[PDB]
Amino acid sequence: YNPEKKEMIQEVIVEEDLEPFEASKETAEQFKHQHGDKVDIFEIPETGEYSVKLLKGATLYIPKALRFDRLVAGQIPTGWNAKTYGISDDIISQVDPITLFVLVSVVEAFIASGITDPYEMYKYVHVSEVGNCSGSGMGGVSALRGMFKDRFKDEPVQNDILQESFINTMSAWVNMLLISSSGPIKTPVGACATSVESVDIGVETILSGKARICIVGGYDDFQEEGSFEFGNMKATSNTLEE
Amino acid sequence: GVATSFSRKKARTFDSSWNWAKQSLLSLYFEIIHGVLKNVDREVVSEAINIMNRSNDALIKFMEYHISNTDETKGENYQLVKTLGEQLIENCKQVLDVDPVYKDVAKPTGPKTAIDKNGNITYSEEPREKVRKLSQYVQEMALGGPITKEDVEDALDKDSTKEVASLPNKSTISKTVSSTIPRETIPFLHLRKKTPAGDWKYDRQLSSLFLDGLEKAAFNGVTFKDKYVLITGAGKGSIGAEVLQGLLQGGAKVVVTTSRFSKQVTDYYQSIYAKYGAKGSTLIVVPFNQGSKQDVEALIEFIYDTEKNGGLGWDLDAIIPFAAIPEQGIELEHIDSKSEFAHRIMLTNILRMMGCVKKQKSARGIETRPAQVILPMSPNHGTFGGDGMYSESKLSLETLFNRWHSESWANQLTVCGAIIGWTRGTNNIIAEGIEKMGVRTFSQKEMAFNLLGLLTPEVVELCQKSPVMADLNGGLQFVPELKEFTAKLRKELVETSEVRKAVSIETALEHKVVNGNSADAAYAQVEIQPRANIQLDFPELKPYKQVKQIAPAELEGLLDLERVIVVTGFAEVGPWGSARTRWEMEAFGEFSLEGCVEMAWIMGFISYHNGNLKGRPYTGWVDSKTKEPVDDKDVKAKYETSILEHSGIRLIEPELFNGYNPEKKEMIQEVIVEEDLEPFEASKETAEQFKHQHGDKVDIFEIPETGEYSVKLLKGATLYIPKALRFDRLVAGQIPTGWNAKTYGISDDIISQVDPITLFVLVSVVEAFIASGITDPYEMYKYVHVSEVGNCSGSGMGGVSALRGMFKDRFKDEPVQNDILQESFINTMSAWVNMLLISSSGPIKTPVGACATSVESVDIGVETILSGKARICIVGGYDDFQEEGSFEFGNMKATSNTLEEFEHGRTPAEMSRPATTTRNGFMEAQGAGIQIIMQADLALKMGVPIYGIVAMAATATDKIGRSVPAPGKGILTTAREHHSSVKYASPNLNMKYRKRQL
Amino acid sequence: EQGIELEHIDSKSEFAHRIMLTNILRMMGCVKKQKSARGIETRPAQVILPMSPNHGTFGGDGMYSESKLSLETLFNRWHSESWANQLTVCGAIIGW
Amino acid sequence: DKNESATINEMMKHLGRSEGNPVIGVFQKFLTGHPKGAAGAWMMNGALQILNSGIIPGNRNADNVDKILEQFEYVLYPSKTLKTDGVRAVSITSFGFGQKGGQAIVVHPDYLYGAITEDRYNEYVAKVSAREKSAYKFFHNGMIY
Amino acid sequence: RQQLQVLARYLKMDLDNGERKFLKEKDTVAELQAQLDYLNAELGEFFVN
Amino acid sequence: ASLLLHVLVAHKLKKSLDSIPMSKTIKDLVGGKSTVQNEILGDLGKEFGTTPEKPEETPLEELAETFQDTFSGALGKQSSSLLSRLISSKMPGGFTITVARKYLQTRWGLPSGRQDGVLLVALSNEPAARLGSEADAKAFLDSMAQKYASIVGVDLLEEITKDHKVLA
């Protein structure tokens, strides 16, 4: 993502007129229902190699680029790998970046509580009384980028991609990889006040009697699908006029 | 018509009898305690046998608890099941571990044609008087008739409860009814025997053991356990539709085929098996036509192939190829294609059915399990009129005896000819005429009994020494010159009908010229068309004495009503419209009048109008396209076709999804080539955002000799036209095509500004308040503080139409409304609810449980309220459907592939098969659904419709978010209790003890 | 056709059935159309159906039986149907 | 469905449900489909139709419930509607990605009024009676216009 | 090869109708055979012949 | 059969062929997320159509034996698709599959059978980004050739243009 080269969709310059236009033998299979019946066929074998024969009047296939202004954001320190914390190599290749942040924060949050292995909780409390009331803003915006924007660009997207786009499925890996907790487990999404809402539902969960221990909190990520939207809302500070 | 219509992948196996047995039983309760069936109805026993036939130790316990818990004091009908049930629970305990029999109970009915003196003809099949049992039928079958001449009286139509005890007892015969055959007298159902001359003469002894086996099969019933039957030609209400009901009761494993394979044809066959099929019974419904040789060369392979090759693993024990097509009016100069086709359905393919089970009999080496064939023959050999080539079709089937002795297939096939007698159904108005000639005509269920007695273990051997003929003809070979004897009986029934049509109308017309219609119009009574009067379905409140009784007496004063949550309204926007017009196609399977007008109004078919149209004051529903008045009585006729055509799970309509055409999914590609001469320029329009791809790759000339300016470049780019390619997941449960919010009162700006999903959510919240007696939301604030009206609604993804706008649409360079990120949220969908309706006042929660959000929403919604944060809370859930979502669900292989459902011959309206052997995935729909839940005591002093009592809601999970797409134990923890010591009684479970403490 | 038993009944038989039955039916079914268009009803054409006593009594003759057996049904029609004035059936026998 | 049916069995198997008293499987999704998020609010929506109607709809698309479901002797799987004499409670269970389960049960409203004094009940009775009419009026004006 | 194509731009002389014809002429022969061999697959090559 | 199998078993697991030993089974291989197991088994099903009913426990080497026999040089649809995307997505402009195949039989002289192997082995080690010039494509193909070859064990005037230019 290079905010001075935001990529978009355009067309190019012209020639001297002599042009019908063919094809090759590779992706005929998904890609065959644009044009119509616009050929100068000859079904008599006098030719030898076969390619759909067409002319001017299409719209086609190269994205382009153009500049942008919102040009700074508070990255995590450049160079931060989960590998440093003990997160496996498979998970990082399978999981969305934002969840990759959330795990690192939950271990350290237990580290910071004298709970070094999550199962000690179960020495004192039933496995069904360890809750979770965490939530994100958009969440998984790196995956939404993969399906709502990347997949129709024709590039390899891991087919499990929808599973990460959720907000439910970011506190899932916490249970899937650390806790082994046991109920219906809530998940707020308050666009920016999610992390107080999370404490709200987290507290009412506990003195309701549903849980003795609850993870609360919040998390979100930053990419251009999000900042550019916030740009045209004129909500985040224009950087050039800064 | 010779087109292939059968696929091995297209079969449909029905076997789960162990379930339908507990369904059919429970079904009895709610006809008897609702007086739909009485103690005198023939079905209570015609059904009790179908549940006995499906007996298991599990089903015994099923009715033991149900009967032993039916409080008889509630009413007389509660006594009628308490007493009848105990018979079944003791009857079924006997016939457990015995083979299941069928024992036809229906009142045998005779034909009865009556013409109005108005000259109007009508046919009725009334219950015969001399025969009210099946034993009465088989005796009057034995006595022959006056032209065929050269009592254990029970409580059938009197008390069906006491007959139930008689079903398991084997009421043995002593005086064999084959003795009642008078000498020189031919009974009505006689078998035949070839004489060394060559013909077939009535044999008495050989027709005796057939006929008493029937009478035995009528008191005890016959079992067909371990049978394996093929039977073709079984349309609803046809010849062999009733043998199927008999084959299935006996425990037969059956193959039934159909020419018209659709969904209503199998939902027929499903109801057949769920009613009749007994323990071990199995039917397979495959598509088929007889007239396709390539299709019999493939149905039997499918029956004689292992369940590993995809086959069926069976082996046929009886074949019943009844399938025929009608042709009438076809005489000798009209015999052509349709006949030359019908000849193949009946003859040369019934020949190649037998000619091709032998190939399988003989390749396995099976030579001790021969398949009895049941050829449907007839006495009509060109004796009737122009039936087409239907004669030399069924006449050239008794040549199937000159071969069982001649040819080599004697060990694998055993012919057992039969007779189409005169069975009514499929000319029906002259049956009562012939029966006056001492001739019997058969109901289909009656001729069912006969051909079905042609499988009795007695005859099966008898077929297995010699081919048998079985003349089930009532004697219609004796009434001489039957053709015009028939053609006269009906030629008279049209005279006596039409003359009383003509004489009646003119005398009524005579009465209009001597008295005039000026006074005769007052006799034309005014007859009123019902109008659509929708309802709100508020809970009915039975008087206080009734309800103080249903709850424990100690309950009053024992609950903190501030702490009892209670649903108070609800609403919905689904594929079937509101929650009133889905509960109709849910519970009742079809729309009422009030359901068909509402589905007409929310699909924008009918509008309203008052004022003056066509000058005349019109007040009421009108067309919406043509604006031409339409009454609510002619709406079900005029629209119900399209309303159902465009509602529920459907082939995805693209204009509901702004061009999404699942056969043209758009993607990103490149094009074909030219002859080489090309540098490439630009124009003067969008130089401004779009200038940082290429690099320094020009052949510049900065000297003005040129004149117009464009960046000069060459090969080596990647550029700018998307492309398209196909997809499979091809149906989803749209909202009814045509649904506009404009219809509900939603402004035009909002729909242009808001995401579709929120546009659903508003409509559901108004209706949810409508449904709660809260017509304007501010009345809430009469009773509660503005800060105690909550909201705990949430979506799945939510706003997926906006994410499509920014994460996918915006970089396509097309106009996207710059407020677009605001709608993508899940927080900002319950916002417009507050922004447009409520004016509520706190921190307002919002769950996102990918699919269990709507229970989580109730969970946080309840804990919110009894926490004390809110007195009233909106809960609920909602989501939408577009290709960014379905395609993701596609490659997860989570929703059912549609093409491989069009190769299982599954239909759109059935591709969602929950808890089904052939389930393949699910179907994503779109819409919303919410409900207002409140405290209790607030609902009692507010005066609102209390619909429920959410007594518990609880979400549960294993541990950390680890692996999403697989479910687990989670909720089982809602039952965590400790049974370590249960020997003593727990006082807290009693109320009489908790009341004393209070 | 000979050697054709029930599992061998196929094309050659389904063809022979048409040579013998459904086209002897459409021969008679189509001299009437000409008898009746001229109006000829006093000069009827006697048909001579070659029948046989072999109705599946011999061995594997193919579909030669229900071919020539489904020709005596040509009497259930001379009385039933309308072509009685133009055609008069006169069955016969392939003896030996 | 293999799992959802499985878990219902044990929580009745464990709670000591009477042998031979199964709960009746209502599968709303055959009509409507799966509204990824709206699910439990369609099936809680229907579950309230049932408490006040006593009419248990059926899976009109249930060809053949799988044999593997027979081991769960505490659950039926109907295919035709069933006008009962009255349901007393309905359980609404739901499952989705991310191991979020969820089971809410509803009791019949009439058990509530047993907890209030009489004069208060028929007082509330008159109160609803008026609201019902008013809601009827408003629903029809809006529906028209 | 280049000077050819640009020269065909000018006469508007399609070089590929000689194949679009031939291609549509071909698949409506395969689907025409697909009928013609279904009959031999169901009537038999002794009957049709 | 082993070649294709191994190559197709690493393409769906984003790991190089070395990280996946044939001896192990897919059951262990997946890691648990059974979502990939169904996809991995489904991807091979279309590229072999033949399969035992429960392959998820059969080792890679054991499952390859059954496919090695049946399959005869038929690169299959899935494989064909996969290769097409590879060359399409990541290879410079004008450098189509035909050109690559021709270069392999010209600059290294490998037939279709050997050519396919090299192209099939290239998928395992796809470049993370589109290669720039023909040199990169030629080098990549040549670099992959060594691996493919090793994976098997098979080692290996002007004036006519001057005036042809002037008139232009």
Ligand SMILES: NC(=O)c1ccc[n+]([C@@H]2O[C@H](COP(=O)([O-])OP(=O)(O)OC[C@H]3O[C@@H](n4cnc5c(N)ncnc54)[C@H](OP(=O)(O)O)[C@@H]3O)[C@@H](O)[C@H]2O)c1
């Ligand atoms: N009723 C009598 O008086 C009498 C007398 C003598 C013989 N029979 C015999 O009665 C038998 C049983 O039926 P029915 O005649 O009683 O009633 P029927 O209504 O003639 O039964 C007809 C069945 O034929 C099936 N069918 C029609 N065309 C077909 C085709 N091309 N391929 C496959 N199946 C086809 C149809 O099944 P679907 O409807 O599901 O398509 C239809 O229901 C017939 O076989 C007939 O020969 C009857």
